[PDB]
């Protein structure tokens, strides 16, 4: 039972290492998601609920299945209780439960690494929360940034030196695009969890509007 645990962990770690990178960082107006994605159709970043966002790295069919299941869970909870019941902590806990079960019960573990981020509700003061959920169901509370997929170490170090709390949109975007290289609009997918939006915080920054911010 120890050899199986190592080989499964290796199979997954290698699949994540072969996929493109995604970074999630906290800024003045919320959370920013930047991913290396040449595709215009296949999304790596998405809305989960009102103030909750999703970002993933790894095998597409596997994380899209998790994105769908998370939206399913979030909408069911918000309807059965209240919209405020759906938190980042709740969704992260659910993904940890799901990935942990897959790792232990399916033939091949999911070659994915997920990030669930939450911003404050409109007119409230709360520091953004970022969660990293890995292939085995491990959950880590990151206070500043999350780096998933590809080669983690060169991007993580390039971000550790250039980190500013409460950085601006145009500033934090440039710092993120910079750390991703060390490890253009046609090779990127960008989105924010804007804490200044009344209800739905998730907003995509595409095309013409994205060229300006660099």
């Amino acid at each position: 039972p120890e050899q199986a645990m190592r080989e499964r962990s290796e199979l997954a770690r290698k699949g994540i290492a072969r996929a493109k990178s995604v970074v999630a960082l906290a800024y003045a107006g919320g959370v920013l998601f930047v991913a290396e994605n040449p595709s215009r159709s296949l999304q790596k970043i998405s809305e989960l609920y009102d103030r909750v966002g999703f970002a993933a790295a790894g095998k597409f069919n596997e994380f899209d299945n998790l994105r769908r299941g998370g939206i399913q869970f979030a909408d069911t909870r918000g309807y059965a209780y209240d919209r405020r019941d759906v938190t980042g902590r709740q969704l992260a806990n659910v993904y940890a439960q799901t990935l942990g079960t897959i790792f232990t019960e399916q033939a091949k573990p999911y070659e994915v690494e997920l990030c669930v981020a939450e911003v404050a509700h409109y007119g409230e003061t709360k520091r953004p929360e970022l969660y990293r959920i890995t292939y085995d169901g491990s959950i880590a509370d990151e206070p500043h940034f999350v780096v998933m997929g590809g080669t983690t170490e060169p991007i993580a170090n390039a971000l550790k030196e250039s980190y500013a709390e409460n950085a601006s949109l145009t500033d934090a975007l440039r710092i993120a695009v910079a750390a991703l290289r060390a490890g253009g609009v046609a090779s990127l997918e960008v989105a924010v969890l804007d804490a200044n939006r009344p209800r739905r915080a998730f907003r995509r920054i595409t095309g013409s509007a994205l060229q300006a911010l660099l």
Partner: protein, 216 residues
């Protein structure tokens, strides 16, 4: 209780009364029956405050659920189909009236849509230009029949909608008229190319006070 809806050039308006009864006894005076369900739709149910809000909430969740999962909202035909599945599911009662604006229609002037349901849970797109549901529906419809020629834009439309509700109240005790003493007036939603918006209470207060002064 009555809900009315009418198409005006470039859009649609939906308005509903504020009463709720328990036999002959007035049980509510502040009942909101019309709710925005997404950026381009609104539902109205001629029933209790709870049936109206619970229905609108479930339908709003269903429309947004699809948008989050698929990236784009349902087409207007798809929105009706989902509503119809929801209505037929609850029968196995008061029936909804949907007002919406088809953002993908070729002619924007007639892109307003009105959808009702019959006793058997069957949908229907009104082509007459207006519709009403509830205990004062005939009175409201017969009133709109005579006033519809006066509808040229959103404000004209809203006037005709408030007047239809006033006529429903005037002839049906289950429909509440404008309460000048408490300051309670019908609620309304207007939907055009810019989306669905709640009509300010002060605009409805102005229309109702004037229909009263007019008939005085």
């Amino acid at each position: 209780x009555t809900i009315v809806a009418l198409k005006y050039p470039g859009g649609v308006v939906m308005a509903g009364d504020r009463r709720s009864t328990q036999g002959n006894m007035i049980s509510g005076r502040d009942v909101r029956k019309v709710y925005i369900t997404d950026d381009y739709t609104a539902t109205g149910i001629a029933g209790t405050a709870a049936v109206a809000v619970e229905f609108a909430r479930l339908y709003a969740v269903e429309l947004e659920h699809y948008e989050k999962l698929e990236g784009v909202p349902l087409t207007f035909a798809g929105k009706i189909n989902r509503l119809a599945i929801m209505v037929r599911g609850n029968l196995a009662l008061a029936l909804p009236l949907l007002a919406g604006y088809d953002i993908h229609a070729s002619d924007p002037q007639s892109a307003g849509r009105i959808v009702s349901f019959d006793a058997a849970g069957g949908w229907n797109i009104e082509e007459e230009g207006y519709q009403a549901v509830g205990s004062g529906s005939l009175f409201a419809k017969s009133s709109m029949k005579k006033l519809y020629s006066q509808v040229t834009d959103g404000d004209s439309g809203l006037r005709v909608a408030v007047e239809a509700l006033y006529d429903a109240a005037d002839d049906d005790s289950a429909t509440g008229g404008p309460d000048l003493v408490r300051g309670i007036f019908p609620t309304a939603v207007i939907i055009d190319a810019d989306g669905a918006v709640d009509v300010p209470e002060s605009r409805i207060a102005e229309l109702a006070r004037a229909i009263i002064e007019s008939r005085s």
